[PDB]
Amino acid sequence: TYTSDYSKYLDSRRAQDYVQWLMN
Numbered sequence: 001t002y003t004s005d006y007s008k009y010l011d012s013r014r015a016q017d018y019v020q021w022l023m024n
């Protein structure tokens with residue numbers, strides 16, 4: 001669960017980067 005949630009955090013960081021790219 002630590003592991004799976006850390007992965008979701010990384011996925012969230014990536015999706016955030018993507019959101020910024022979409023607006024750039």
